[PDB]
């Protein structure tokens, strides 16, 4: 049941069917390239893409660095028939990896039946294909055949790791936003991937490896296939819809470019950045686009440029857009059918959900930026497999995502040089004469994401008219593996559209790519004058350059920032004195033991508080580590948190702007009792919604403006902890190298073993820090944000009570005999509050999942788990050690364990 049923080799000769030299649409003349049809409607061209866009045809690095965090340039890459053969095989393998998942199997099928609409006709009685949605397949006899296609995978342009969907346009039409769709060209490579940092999984995986992890390329391709899917169905969000950020403040990013489309594609929390009002706007926008396509089809009385029948064609599009067809043959769009389909394309196909299916380590948000680039080879099975990716079953690589740990799995990952320079794009932060200015550069992607307030729009202040008829929007349930299973089991895998004979296009197909909006390169090296040391300074002070000299820890941030041999520590002065002391060889091991103990002790410290509600634990050293808030003793931090709440953690206090809510106006029905009572019930139903809307809104403003600040603080604490380990190691390693060959020979000292120990201590520390910071973020929601919403809601309930009573009394004639019972319904309903339940609006907060993580944590620490299963005694751990059973071993028949 494979997706690609031929196994191609790049040197296979052209057959004119699935292997040919082909012409894609182009502005001017384009040189034919060798392509492979790996599936119906899907082609692969193993070539660096200089053809798609003749404008940028040169594979060299640009004059000015791109403003991304990671980029790589090699002009020679993919110039060889061998590399071409490997590209083809890698891409194919990734298609197969995706297809082998329930989610991927749907996506791939959706893409195939996602045939670009025939909108070519300027006469609406006729149905015609659009030219730029086709290619010309050159035959062995020199003739070309015109053939329509959905998807082409091509090699990357000058920037090897920049992957994107490209497609051709129309003189007037926007094919990606009008529901028509257009053939999608994806720049991709399976021969490289990104490195990233992950501290979150330590909760369930306390043994998580150190250093960078590699993105599973299958996730990356899937990401682009999702874009492709939107673009084919003409539902992509306009590229001028972007999430604006505040760049003016010293702590804010100089600039960041991210689009609603990308947010939609990532899924998870990123997609919850887009508020309900706008998510609605889109759904309606494309629904009407779909409705338009229905009316275009309905008035088409004949087909042109094919031997296929109008019947067959109209049916192709009925199956693509899920159209309802009455007894006459007229098409319309069922809001129910459409909602289901648009939901699958935008909420089911998401990077987040693919990760759930692949079971790989992946960035939880786009705000966890790629820190590195890596050369890989996934073609050999000993490296990467369709089922397991890099994390190979029944081996060390299967545990704790080791397959993706670049250091543990180092043979599969070769570190390349990031073309994006050191401090290429930064801000310059300077403290004032605390003796003259001490300035440091801060990497743009080390700064704070602070979304612009004009990102969150709401109709909350708009009133409504309640009506006997007015009816209720549904619950709008969250996406879950079982809902996906619902779509899956109802999905139709049978009917792929045929590859039809179409009238031959001209030898060259004329067209240009859709224009992308020009984005202002954001400012560089903005300078800032500050009165107080910042978080960025405190963290920078924890760094050192390698060298032969002995570094010392200091408790003075000032000293540390001023001298290359001085590294700041948030550990106690006792630790400082001890790690710095010149240590005799005979005492070296015991010294190290003590240092490892002290390290683990200080980083494991947790103060419990019984005083406050939502925050049970506090990690006190966060204060001196990041200079959170101010003053001196860590007892000040514990104290300030207990007193002021979570707000002391925030870099900026977010605006939460919740207006006076729009009141209800009820339409009166004279003498009609049943209508008058329904209107009353509807106003109460819509009131329950007003509460849910206000809660969704706040949750949305919190994910974007607050939980992102806390996620940064968290990432920085891991950076702090790693720096402390590096420093301590460097000092220990210096001490060892001071010894004589003879002294060393009597000290068995393994720096890799010591490193491994400190990395475990850092993990334990991150577990606590993670819990503390989660409680902190949530506490701020419960206590500092939600209440503004609840006040606006209670004022709304009060107004509605007065209105509803007035409506009842004015209508006492119609309502006679029922007046008392209705008063009670109104007074009782509106005197209650609807409690905010966080578990309702976001995935990670259910109570059970806390116990779930605890069970995982113990199971993932089991390196041998020996059970009797089926007929054999085996190892149920991910290492799957072999078991040899003697002939005289006896197993209890009643319980064979």
């Amino acid at each position: 049941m494979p997706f690609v049923n031929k196994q191609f080799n790049y040197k296979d000769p052209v057959n004119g069917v699935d292997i040919a030299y082909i012409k894609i649409p182009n502005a001017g003349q384009m040189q034919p390239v060798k392509a492979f049809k790996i599936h119906n409607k899907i082609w692969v061209i193993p070539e660096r893409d200089t053809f798609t866009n003749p404008e940028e045809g040169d594979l060299n690095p640009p004059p000015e660095a791109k403003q991304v965090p990671v980029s790589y340039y090699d002009s020679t890459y993919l110039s060889t028939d061998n590399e071409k053969d490997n590209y083809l095989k890698g891409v194919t393998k990734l298609f197969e990896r995706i297809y082998s998942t329930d989610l991927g199997r749907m996506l791939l099928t959706s893409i195939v039946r996602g045939i670009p609409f025939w909108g070519g006709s300027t006469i609406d009685t006729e149905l015609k294909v659009i030219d730029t949605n086709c290619i010309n397949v050159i035959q062995p006899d020199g003739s070309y055949r015109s053939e329509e296609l959905n998807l082409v995978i091509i090699g990357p342009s000058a920037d090897i790791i920049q992957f994107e969907c490209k497609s051709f346009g129309h003189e007037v039409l926007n094919l990606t936003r009008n529901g028509y769709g257009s053939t999608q060209y994806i720049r991709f490579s399976p021969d490289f991937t990104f490195g990233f940092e992950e501290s979150l999984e330590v909760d369930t995986n306390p043994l998580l490896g150190a250093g960078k992890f590699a993105t599973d390329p299958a996730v990356t391709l899937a990401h682009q296939l999702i874009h492709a899917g939107h673009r084919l169905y003409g539902i992509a969000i306009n590229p001028n819809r972007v999430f604006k950020v505040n760049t003016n403040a010293y702590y804010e990013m100089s600039g960041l470019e991210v689009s609603f489309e990308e947010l939609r594609t990532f899924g998870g929390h990123d997609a919850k950045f887009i508020d309900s009002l706008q998510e609605n706007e889109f759904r309606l926008y494309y629904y009407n686009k779909f409705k338009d396509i229905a009316s275009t089809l309905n008035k088409a009385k004949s087909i042109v440029g094919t031997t296929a029948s109008l019947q067959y064609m109209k049916n192709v599009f009925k199956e693509k857009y899920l159209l309802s067809e009455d007894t006459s043959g007229k098409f319309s769009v069922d809001k129910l059918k459409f909602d289901k389909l648009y939901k699958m394309l935008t909420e089911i196909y998401t990077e987040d959900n693919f990760v759930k299916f692949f079971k790989v380590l992946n960035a939880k948000t786009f705000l966890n930026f790629d820190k590195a680039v890596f050369k890989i080879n996934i073609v050999p099975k000993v490296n990467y497999t369709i089922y397991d990716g890099f994390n190979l079953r029944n081996t060390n690589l299967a545990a704790n995502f080791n397959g993706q740990n670049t250091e543990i799995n180092n043979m599969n990952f070769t570190k390349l040089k990031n073309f994006t320079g050191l401090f290429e794009f930064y801000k310059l932060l300077c403290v004032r004469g605390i003796l003259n200015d001490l300035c440091i550069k801060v990497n743009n992607w080390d700064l704070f994401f602070s979304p612009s307030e004009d990102n969150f729009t709401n109709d909350l202040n708009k009133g409504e008219e309640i009506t006997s008829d007015t009816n209720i929007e549904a619950a709008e349930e969250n996406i879950s593996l079982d809902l996906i299973q619902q779509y899956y089991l109802t999905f139709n895998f049978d009917n792929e559209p045929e590859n039809i004979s179409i009238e031959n296009l001209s030898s060259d197909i004329i067209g240009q790519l859709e224009l992308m909006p020009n984005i202002e390169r954001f400012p560089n090296g903005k300078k800032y004058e500050l009165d107080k040391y910042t978080m960025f300074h405190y963290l920078r002070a924890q760094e050192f350059e390698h060298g032969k000299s002995r570094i010392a820890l200091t408790n003075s941030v000032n000293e540390a920032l001023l001298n290359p041999s001085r590294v700041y520590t948030f550990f106690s002065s006792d630790y400082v004195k001890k790690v710095n002391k010149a240590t005799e060889a005979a005492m070296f091991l015991g010294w190290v033991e003590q240092l490892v103990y002290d390290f683990t002790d200080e980083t494991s410290e947790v103060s419990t508080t019984d005083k406050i509600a939502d925050i049970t634990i506090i990690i006190p050293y966060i204060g001196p580590a990041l200079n959170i808030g101010n003053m001196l003793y860590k007892d000040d931090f514990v104290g300030a948190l207990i007193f002021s709440g979570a707000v002391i953690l925030l870099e900026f206090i977010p605006e939460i702007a919740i207006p006076v809510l729009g009141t209800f106006a009820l339409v009166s029905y004279i003498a009609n009792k049943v209508l008058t009572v329904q209107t009353i019930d509807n106003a109460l139903s819509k009131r329950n919604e007003k509460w849910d809307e206000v809660y969704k809104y706040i949750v949305t403003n919190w994910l974007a403006k607050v939980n992102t600040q806390i996620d940064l603080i968290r990432k920085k604490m891991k950076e702090a902890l790693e720096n402390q380990a590096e420093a301590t190691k460097a000092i220990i390693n210096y001490q060892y190298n001071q010894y004589t060959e003879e002294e060393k020979n009597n000290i068995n000292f393994n720096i890799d073993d010591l490193s491994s120990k400190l990395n475990e201590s850092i993990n334990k520390a991150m577990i606590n820090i993670n819990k503390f910071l989660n409680q902190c973020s949530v506490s701020y929601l419960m206590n500092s944000m939600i209440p503004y919403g609840v006040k606006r809601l209670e004022d709304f309930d009060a107004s509605l009570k007065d209105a509803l009573l007035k409506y009842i009394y004015d209508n006492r004639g119609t309502l006679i005999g029922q007046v008392d019972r209705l008063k009670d319904k109104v007074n009782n309903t509106l005197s209650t509050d609807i409690p905010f339940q966080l578990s309702k609006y976001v995935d990670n907060q259910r109570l059970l999942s806390t116990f779930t993580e605890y069970i995982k944590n113990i199971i993932n620490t089991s390196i041998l788990n020996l059970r009797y299963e089926s007929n054999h005694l085996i190892d149920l751990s991910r290492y799957a050690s072999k078991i040899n059973i003697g002939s005289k071993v006896n197993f209890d028949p009643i319980d064979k364990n």
Partner: nanobody, 119 residues
Framework: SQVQLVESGGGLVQPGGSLRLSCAAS????????MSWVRQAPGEGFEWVSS???????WDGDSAKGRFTTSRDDAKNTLYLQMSNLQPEDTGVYYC??????????????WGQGTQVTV
């Protein structure tokens, strides 16, 4: 009738000034197809020489770029190849072939009988 391809050129000059090869086609309109030039040296495989599009555009391989210019005359239905600055490593039999970048004998393709070149 059928598809016929016939090359014409003598192929003798010592290194090395110039030569104009010719291919007369019948059965089809020359300008409606992708055509190629390819040579086979004594005791050796095929090498892609040139290619010409219906659009009249001409692409040339590593061999003889900045040397040969591929051309056509539609009324005379004949494919021309203009060679210059020839060397001894250019020796072999020159076939006018049916595809784009035709490197090989492909079922369905048409060829000439070959034209000798000794330099």
């Amino acid at each position: 009738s059928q598809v016929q391809l016939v090359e014409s050129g003598g192929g003798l000059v010592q290194p090395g000034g110039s030569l104009r090869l010719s291919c007369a086609a019948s059965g089809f309109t020359l300008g409606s197809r992708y055509m190629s030039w390819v040579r086979q040296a004594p005791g050796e495989g095929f090498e892609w020489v040139s290619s010409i599009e219906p659009s009249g555009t001409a692409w040339d391989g590593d061999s003889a770029k900045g040397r040969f210019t591929t051309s056509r005359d539609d009324a005379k239905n004949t494919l021309y190849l203009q060679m210059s600055n020839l060397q001894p490593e250019d020796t072999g039999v020159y076939y006018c072939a049916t595809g784009y970048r035709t490197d090989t004998r492909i079922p369905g393709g048409s060829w000439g009988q070959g034209t000798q070149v000794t330099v």
